[PDB]
Design a protein around this ligand. Structure first.
Ligand code: K
Ligand code: K
Lengths: 10, 314, 314, 314, 313, 11
């Protein structure tokens, strides 16, 4: 989904 | 978000991970105190006095990120070559620090509420009471029920009291119409009486996931509403000005065409469509296409958020 | 879900995989008896006596998990760097354990049903008879057929007896109405007579895939039904209470508005909509938007499951 | 699907690719004759007589698959760590063989049609003529045209003769109704006259992409049609048997309800829906839900194929 | 799009990146001047005089891409094993040159518009004025307003002259009908007066993202329109010729069936459908299926573009 | 109106 975990958590 | 990195010119040491040799400056290891590699007290056990090397019979692919933590001076991230469990097992062994481990994880009576002590019955009883209250409400709106409603409200008040947060707000809302009991005030309180259906959020997990998704995508919901507002205004104005040139006008005004524009954008369907002329039909076709596009645009983000929350929960 | 790892202090050995050197002491290999590396008997052939070094002329990127399987003491997790075929042969070559291989599989007369020995004609006849029975059913519902139905039923019974599971249940069901033959019971049996269409699951592969997907998505289906139920109840209540202030009420009661709520949530379209006032129209727009969102939320999980099952089958 | 791998007991050599040392025996090299490494003639240049090493100043991560060709004896998959261009040059350098490159590639006058020689004017004229023919048709069906139709057919047959494959089949079909010209036969030929619109496949690229996707998605198209057929039959039977218990029968027979089932499953909308009772409304709600699910099931295969073809073309 | 690779026969040097040894020709290093490795002056400090090697205490997994730039002689691309920030730091560490890093970035008064200096109040006032103008327009179309419309136009033109792309074009358009003020011309100007709703593009970021997505998906929009046109024509012809065999013909002509074809393709719903016979119903079912398919086809490209732009912004 | 919001993955 997100390559670098963009906008992960909050 | 900013970190410090070692600078070169003393003594260079070699670290062996199951045959993979790593050469690092002692200054790089000394940046982070404590830890296995940070201090020599807990490195003598793994140090080889013969070959002058430190041996760690572990997984070789995971040592690059662990070493890079010293190299980056604070930046720790799991490379996409290994599962989460294998990376997790590594960090405790090297003991990167409680502040480092938990921060990395972020990157990844009163018996009633709990579902145990064989009191699950209480939860089942509450769910049955909620369903019964919904059924009695719907049947009361049909062309007695007051006693059952009183019993349901008594149970709701007792449950809220023994518990005594959005769930608490819903619980307190569920009884305000009953304790309260112009015609507009009566109409609105009878309407807000329906919020008893939201009391299922305590017991249902999918409802909680949906609520979390709605909370986490407020910007996306606002953008979707904004796009629908722009579309309905534009297309209602277009169709009204297209059909203003006829003696018998299907749409009396732009606000009258808001419903037609909304149902065409959403592809619900207005119904009868014959009296509208050719220009109105062209505007309606454009409105349908634009509605499909503008509703298919922002929904995927909410869908992905819901999927992520559901997978995290399960 | 717990595994053990060798701890440091005996003798260390070196493993060579196409030039890539691996260092590991004997206790890690001694953790797993048998296998190519666990016992010395099956590894002395690949040992080089002059260099005191084990040589393995194999692929270097796939050996990392092989060593980690010994390192992790049972946790054999595939690395995503290679195709499945190369990793399949690598584990067999080391004979890491017959029981060990099995868990990796899920980690990644009576001549009638088997479509061979020319039994393909017997199948074709079964499909033709099923289609003929469906056609005769639809035709007898139009404003003789009894003989054709009798032939279809006797063929079904003969097939069931020859074969003598959900398919078996469907086959038994397909003849129960005919063997049976208040008005309600007659209507029920006539309705359940349609279950003959499900007999195509034996021959159709896509129908089997759909059935497996439905079996594997029961939670998703339940969540979808729950969301639609909540939305329908809420919006029916909203529209009924919005229209309760008019002399000519389009909706007599909340249950009366259930059909309108369902068709608006599913975007099917109610049809005639003019008598509804402005508040009802606002509630309808909100219902349409919420229905689009609610339908869009849990579908791309059943969709993914169906795609996975279809690709696995094909 | 099967290949042979070298087995040990003679002579072994080392390959040094910019510091990444690879050690393989000559038997592995000798399995593939020719090539850069198969014969000593074309690999002696890179050989270093001083260190007895083969030096290859190329990219390290791409050599794993190159050695795997010798390792597996005919099996080649690209490792997922490098772009396609990097590996394409890498394999071409070692000249694995024309059959090898082709295998890897598959695993990942008459001046009229060729749009050059500033004949693009011919293509523009053809597109304009096709559009004019479509317009002439759509206005000749309204409540002279024959001359323009004759001119369009003359241009079509001239282009066909000059050019003289389903596209050629469409070109043949586009003139058959005109050259031909019971009432049913006349209606059929007038209908098949519309296939002039498909002549745009010659010029448009998106139309060709759609045609290729439809050809490559025949299985899921058939599956979608089968699912629609099953759902329509089931729900038509259910609604007919649920509603037939009243004096006023909205549906005369099961075939009568096929259109309603189709529009409900596809969410088009039947329209007026009042006379059907509560059981029919429940059946309709279930039909709408099941139709949404069944039409959402197979289409994320068709769309994926279309996206792949579109990206390949562009 | 063409690059040159070093060809052997003169000296070879070894690079030690945190234990990972690399062997590369000196001519490869000399292909790119300047930089850390291009000249001995900027790399002599990092050199190890006793081991005859260069010791780089940096991230070893990312050195392969750095070496490939010299190996390929002009090609730089990050492999998918490290975050982009790590690679961005590494290339700055070696200082490949701004002439090379520049093409890598895209590989993956006048105080009014700038929302700072306590000017956000001006933006709020502008948004309120735009909303008020839209409301007055919608209300005056109902069965005075002129003064409020004049005030809104005065504010719009004041902002335009104070500030004096496409947003400026929209701002100019928003006052053209007012400054102008056959029946067709009046209808056209009253219709184009609605363009005031597009002035919200200046303030709203999501609407700007939508505009960028529309600009970047013109080919897909055209393909969608073309597919809809083809399907509409085909199914209108089919249904008209199916229902032309009855005295009471529901559709008078193929153009009359265009609306029915559009609503069936888009699954909106024609409404009354009883008089059409069995052949027309079959044609309608086929039209509904084909509409669902042909609309679901080209959408998850506009969707992908919108998602990309939203994540970027 | 908007359930075909698919993506990649699936393998
Ligand atoms: K619809
Ligand atoms: K609809």
């Amino acid at each position: 989904a997100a390559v670098a975990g963009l906008y992960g958590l909050g």
